[PDB]
Write a protein that binds this ligand. Sequence first.
Ligand SMILES: Nc1ncnc2c1ncn2[C@@H]1O[C@H](CSCC[C@H](N)C(=O)O)[C@@H](O)[C@H]1O
Length: 228
Amino acid sequence: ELQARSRIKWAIDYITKYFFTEGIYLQKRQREQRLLESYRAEGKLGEVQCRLMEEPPDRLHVLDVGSCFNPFSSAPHLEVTALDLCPATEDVLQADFLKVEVVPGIREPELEEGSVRRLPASHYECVIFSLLLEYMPSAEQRLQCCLQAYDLLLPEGILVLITPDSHLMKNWRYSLARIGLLRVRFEKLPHISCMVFRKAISRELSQHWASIHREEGMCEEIRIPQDD
Ligand SMILES: Nc1ncnc2c1ncn2[C@@H]1O[C@H](CSCC[C@H](N)C(=O)O)[C@@H](O)[C@H]1O
């Protein structure tokens, strides 16, 4: 029995609205298509390749990284693959996410010696990093995780990012835009920030947005307060 008003219920509700009950993936699609027209009209971008999602399937492919106990798996039409460095429950796969390869053409996790080594590229409507990134040892490795999430997501799929409290979020927005993830939601919950980043229709589009909004002194990586 999940806690109401938790990060878990927030994410389930957002995922449902984004893919089914509010068609947010289409709203943001139109927004990105307008942004691309504006950039082309200013000569800042040429013809770029766009990749669009098809109508979402009823059962969404969801990857829960750092899952611990698979809280999302009973949520309606989420087909959850849950990974954790130290699984707490038997339905969570053991994996160090930093050592996972993203492989096109496979359709399920591939394990060696009980540890996930390979995950299907461009396969998941949604990737969830709920309180995960602050356990990574470096800002480089936090970015690495999001780069892998990018390769794992279908076009217009979403990376759900939940992180504790203690701006740095402006820099995260810039750094993720640089690699093709545009932020589409930010909400404060008790003691946490809840964010969603979308695999934009075009990586080059997102890259150019990031270029326009780069501020002095902000870095490429994903820092946390305890980087000092
Ligand atoms: N490199 C890594 N690869 C996979 N999981 C990792 C990891 N580093 C830390 N984790 C896991 O990430 C989890 C962070 S606690 C967050 C747990 C859960 N997602 C929640 O919302 O409460 C822990 O279970 C930890 O084991």
